[PDB]
Design a protein around this ligand. Structure first.
Ligand SMILES: *[C@@H]1O[C@H](CO)[C@@H](O[C@@H]2O[C@H](CO)[C@@H](O)[C@H](O)[C@H]2NC(C)=O)[C@H](O)[C@H]1NC(C)=O
Ligand SMILES: O=c1ccn([C@@H]2O[C@H](COP(=O)(O)OP(=O)(O)O)[C@@H](O)[C@H]2O)c(=O)[nH]1
Ligand SMILES: *[C@@H]1O[C@H](CO[C@@H]2O[C@@H](C)[C@@H](O)[C@@H](O)[C@@H]2O)[C@@H](O)[C@H](O)[C@H]1NC(C)=O
Ligand SMILES: OC[C@H]1O[C@@H](O)[C@H](O)[C@@H](O)[C@H]1O
Ligand SMILES: [Mn+2]
Length: 267
């Protein structure tokens, strides 16, 4: 599928239970390292394999290119295709990850597309997935069901009426972090080229899901995805899946906190 970089993995020999696909720009090496030492550390969670890969495009900068090439050689966890890695190309990045799942890891039980400014509790997510008994046509996260396109011309998320001509967006989940059974990736890739393009990646996935008649489901009876951020407590982060607004230094302090407090019980 025209991939410049592929992770050294074989999902047929060892079918992963959860695959994390993380978006980060080239210069965000600090974010990728913090994730690699924290929630992205590959391991067995309740006997289920967790794999973590980073989605990258390409950049004009030769320096950055070299750096990333070196990182791929040292880590072997980068998925890359030739597309200008900018905020308005995140739909290409997301479709790149979905294509990678479809071509090289269709065996994954579940896939999580996440951003790099985030805390992910994989242990609580794995537990909640094994309790849902939903292994096909499954898609969850922070559900956004009546969103209106931003028409403020200078907003980061402005879309003109030519880019998106309708009053409302389809049902979708925040791109901060969404999870789907591995089969959905193949369906989204197959229908992607026939769905009207939009530069907001989570909206675009929503348009595809709408085309495929796959409905959005809440993961749990309590909220577990927090795109707005949360006040930190070891007890709260033990009972959530994802939290946004987390810079790298903060991610390491939180992981040290949960590591320092393992063994303590919580109200
Ligand atoms: C997203 O990435 C694509 C692919 O790199 C960009 O399209 C190319 O843009 C470069 C310069 O930006 C041109 O030299 C090429 O002719 C374009 N090729 C293709 C395949 O279209 C595109 O511009 C990027 N989008 C944004 C918003 O920057
Ligand atoms: O050129 C870019 C810019 C951003 N991102 C990633 O896209 C996500 C969204 O960017 P940001 O967090 O700045 O936006 P917001 O949270 O405001 O939507 C983050 O994981 C970034 O690392 C990326 O992969 N390439
Ligand atoms: C998932 O399934 C768990 C156990 O399996 C169930 O046991 C049999 C006897 C039937 O009750 C059948 O529904 C299941 O296969 C349940 O404990 C659990 O509640 C289920 N999850 C949900 C949210 O329904
Ligand atoms: O391109 C749309 C973007 O808007 C928001 C989200 O946090 C990003 O990950 C992405 O979905
Ligand atoms: Mn963000």
């Amino acid at each position: 599928g025209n991939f410049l970089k592929l992770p050294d993995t074989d999902c047929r020999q060892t079918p992963p239970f959860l695959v994390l696909l993380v978006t980060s720009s080239h210069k965000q090496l600090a974010e990728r390292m913090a994730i690699r030492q924290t929630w992205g550390k590959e391991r067995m969670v309740k006997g289920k394999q967790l794999k973590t890969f980073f989605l990258l495009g390409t950049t004009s900068s030769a320096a950055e290119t070299k750096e990333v090439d070196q990182e791929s050689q040292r880590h072997g966890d980068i998925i890359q295709k030739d597309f200008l890695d900018v905020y308005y190309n995140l739909t290409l990045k997301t479709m790149m990850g979905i294509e990678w799942v479809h071509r090289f890891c269709p065996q994954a039980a579940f896939v999580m597309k996440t951003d790099s400014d985030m805390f992910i509790n994989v242990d609580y997510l794995t537990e909640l997935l094994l309790k849902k008994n939903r292994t096909t046509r499954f898609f969850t996260g922070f559900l956004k069901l009546n969103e209106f396109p931003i028409r403020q011309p200078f907003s980061k998320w402005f879309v003109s009426k030519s880019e998106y001509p309708w009053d409302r967006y389809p049902p979708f989940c925040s791109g901060t972090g969404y999870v789907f059974s591995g089969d959905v990736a193949s369906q989204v890739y197959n229908v992607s080229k026939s769905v009207p393009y939009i530069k907001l990646e989570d909206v675009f996935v929503g348009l595809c899901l709408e085309r495929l008649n796959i409905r959005l489901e809440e993961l749990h009876s309590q909220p577990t995805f927090f795109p707005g951020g949360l006040r930190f407590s070891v007890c709260l982060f033990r009972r959530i899946v994802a939290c946004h607004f987390i810079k790298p230094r903060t991610l390491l302090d939180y992981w040290q906190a949960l590591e320092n407090s393992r063994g303590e019980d919580c109200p």
